[PDB]
Write a protein that binds this DNA or RNA. Structure first.
Lengths: 98, 93, 108, 84, 108, 93, 84, 98
DNA sequence: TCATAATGGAGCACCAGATTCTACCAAAAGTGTATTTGGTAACTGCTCCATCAAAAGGCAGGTTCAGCTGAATTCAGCTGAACCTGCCTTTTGTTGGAGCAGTTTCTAAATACACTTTTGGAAGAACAGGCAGAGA
DNA sequence: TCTCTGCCTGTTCTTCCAAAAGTGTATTTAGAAACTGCTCCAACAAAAGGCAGGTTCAGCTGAATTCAGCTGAACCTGCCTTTTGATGGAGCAGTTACCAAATACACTTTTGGTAGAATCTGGTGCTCCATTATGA
């Protein structure tokens, strides 16, 4: 059976997902998460569908940017694998982390 | 009377919290900058809140929501408590 | 003519309700300004001022000084999580930094 | 319908991997998925808190796209394509 | 009685000078708005719009597409240094990211 | 009802830069957001400039200085050129 | 007056080292000083450009502390203690 | 003669300059720099003394914060020495490079 | 982990520069009218959001299985630190000269504020042209 | 990373209604001129403390190797999502009839700003510690 060497399919995936623009999280679980978070601030909240879509667009843009920073921090440490410490450093220098 | 500042009121508040403590002139300048900056933040957010909801008037609801949006966590709770208490006392008079 | 009573004294505040009302009216923040908006804003500004000054006077007491200086304001702001959040993009002139050496840098 | 709980785990590992691939990440630690879920939950909490504050000020019960747009813009994360 | 003509036509603009003047007056920016302020602002808005639209149409043509889409606006903005700087804190819905793989990740 | 937008003027500008290119409605929404965002930036900075210099009027000087403060480099240069050309054309009428 | 006399070198190596020490830095590469000079030159260029735009709008010839405070606030770097 | 080992005086200085608040760049050289790079408004600008002092306070605050971020990046790469690449990573995560 | 230097902290005395604390005074905040408009307060339509049900089909989850990357250990040279001179550049204290930033009349642009009048732009509907959906 | 279909959707024509245009007046605002006092700039000088350079040399950085951990890649399955289609009603937006409440205008009084003097707190020398750092 054919096997691609590690990182070949990863590079193909990088190209595929940087080429496209669609949302990479599933809409229904993200909506459930959004409603779950929101019920701590007010009960019996309703959401416009476009509100949930705005939240998902903003969240995915934020996470893609944070992953770009994380990959830079991983490369600075002479690694290719991103680790939680890379996310932590990117967040610290962004001012998101104390 | 040419300039105006919060020094008088900052010093009243200081004598309230710390009777025996003074304040430097540079510290008073920083406190003035702080009060002006926070006033600008809250007033601007209240202005935007009124514009969003198509209202002509900035009320204490706009100020309260601006405080909630701007201040973090427990600062917002205690600021809202103080503002509501102040408006209640003012209205009773 | 009843003798004048300041709106700050009516609200039980130290900060100026009338000046705050005039500054709201003069800042082009909106067409109109309610009667309780200056009172609320003065109360919030006084609360925040009292918070910072409490912490700064505590810092002044720690350093055995009887007078607050910009260093003490900086210490109070940066040692408080919420004030540091509020004033995270603010520079305090002559305030310095918090003493903090990364543990990796200390002698073995 | 029962009240929602534990919906962060619906941000699956493959979804996080896709978001990482769009970020140019070739290799991912196994511990990145829980870290990512925590970071996402904090971001969503911050944005939804402001969105609900805007919703409550307007005396509405529905959170609209403009409330989200205002909450994001308030945080320096301006979003185009949903109003404004 | 002259038959009236838009201030955009007088200024030689496509963007609405009258609407922009009304938005300036009603936006609570100042108590007065000058006559040439809306003309200047509408001209600047038209210039920036044309700049972005030219780059986005170039991107659309490169993609063999006859129509601009949020992806083309994203590509135009992020491939241009000035527009990227101006719109650096902005996320465009359904614009994606620029294709960019770090050189060290490519096959060794 | 009957909300306003810049769609008409953005399509008029597009027909100038690219006569044969169209634009999707989502792209036009992005462009409306862009125009309103930049209008708010310029207008807010011009309001601040008028306040700083203790003026009541926002004139084309305020818009010019706001454009210079807000746009970068060549964008600011070309935008100032365009606004000045527009105002010179408008006043000559 | 106007000066152009290579005085970015007036921001000396010991001064940059002191700034690094207040930043918690224990060991400094010898290439850090020219890097820091470039970074400071860029930062100062941005702030002074905004400050002089503010000065020119006011039709003044003198750059005042308020112009600098406004430029810094515009850059996202609010400063207390100079009349804000 | 007495010799302190490397890093001992460096740590003493870290404590010294984190304890203090005085400006760490000489005033006159910084004033010359400020007047020099005012190539904006060619020419003949005057400066208030407090204008240059506000500039210097902002500049030193900016550099101290940037050195804090640089030191975090250096530690993340398992180093004690800050290098130009650490400054570059800090400025890129901050959004200053682009 | 035993003694010697080097450093930073901590008592005292002596200022001297800054805070407090008073007095005047003028600018601005209360008082109190009229008065006008913005903003609740019902009272509906009407949209839109929220449950349900139910078929595909795609996606995610769990198992290998192996390759490759992260992590450690070692080693060596390099480079940065600590120190000591000798220099030089800043800092501070003076003049002085000049520019220029604020303060006051006065006037004349230019802006706001009202009508009616037309025009432009925002809803709708009708239609064909992109372009996503598949054919190797 | 390849032609032709068929649907979605962009473009484009009609209403009509909101708003932008032209007059016609009134009036603040801002520009212009003048004038003053407040910095700002610019030289001179003179201590002295930062700084620059050179020297050792100790520790850090980087390179090489090994190897175990881990994580990609592929493959089955299961599941869950997603896409219709109802429908129940929840709530949001629009239309009236007020009315509270904010604006606007004199007038008065008070309060906050600006000088001015006194004390007095913080800095600054000296000095005595008490830590730390550094090898036999």
């Amino acid at each position: 059976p054919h096997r691609y060497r590690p990182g070949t399919v990863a590079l193909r995936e990088i190209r595929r997902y940087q080429k496209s623009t669609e949302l990479l999280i599933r809409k229904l679980p993200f909506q459930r998460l959004v409603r779950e978070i929101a019920q701590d601030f007010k009960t019996d909240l309703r959401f416009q569908s476009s509100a949930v879509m705005a939240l998902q667009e903003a969240c995915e843009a934020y996470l893609v940017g944070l992953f770009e920073d994380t990959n830079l921090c991983a490369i600075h440490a002479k690694r290719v694998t991103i680790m939680p410490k890379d996310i932590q450093l990117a967040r610290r220098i962004r001012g998101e982390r104390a | 009377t040419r300039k105006e500042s919060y020094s008088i009121y900052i010093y009243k508040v200081l004598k309230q919290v710390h009777p025996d403590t003074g304040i430097s002139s540079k510290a008073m300048s920083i406190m003035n900058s702080f009060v002006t900056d926070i006033f600008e933040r809250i007033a601007s957010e209240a202005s935007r809140l009124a514009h969003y909801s198509k209202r002509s008037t900035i009320s204490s609801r706009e100020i309260q929501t601006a405080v909630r949006l701007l201040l973090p966590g427990e600062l917002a709770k205690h600021a809202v408590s103080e503002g509501t208490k102040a408006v209640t006392k003012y209205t009773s008079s | 003519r009843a003798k004048a009573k300041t709106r700050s004294s009516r609200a039980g505040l130290q900060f100026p309700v009338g000046r705050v009302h005039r500054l709201l009216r003069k800042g082009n923040y909106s067409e109109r300004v309610g009667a309780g908006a200056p009172v609320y804003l003065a109360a919030v500004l006084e609360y925040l001022t009292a918070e910072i000054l409490e912490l700064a006077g505590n810092a002044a007491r720690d350093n055995k000084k009887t007078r607050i200086i910009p260093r003490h304001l900086q210490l109070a702001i940066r040692n408080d999580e919420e004030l540091n959040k509020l004033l995270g993009r603010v520079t305090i002139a002559q305030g310095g930094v918090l003493p903090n050496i990364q543990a990796v840098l200390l002698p073995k | 319908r029962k009240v929602l709980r534990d919906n962060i785990q619906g941000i699956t590992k493959p979804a996080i991997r896709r978001l990482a691939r769009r970020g140019g990440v070739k290799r991912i630690s196994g511990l990145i998925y829980e870290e990512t879920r925590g970071v996402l939950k904090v971001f969503l909490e911050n944005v939804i808190r402001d969105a609900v504050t805007y919703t409550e000020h307007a005396k509405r019960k529905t959170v609209t796209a403009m409330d989200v747009v205002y909450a994001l813009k308030r945080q320096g994360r301006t979003l185009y394509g949903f109003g404004g």
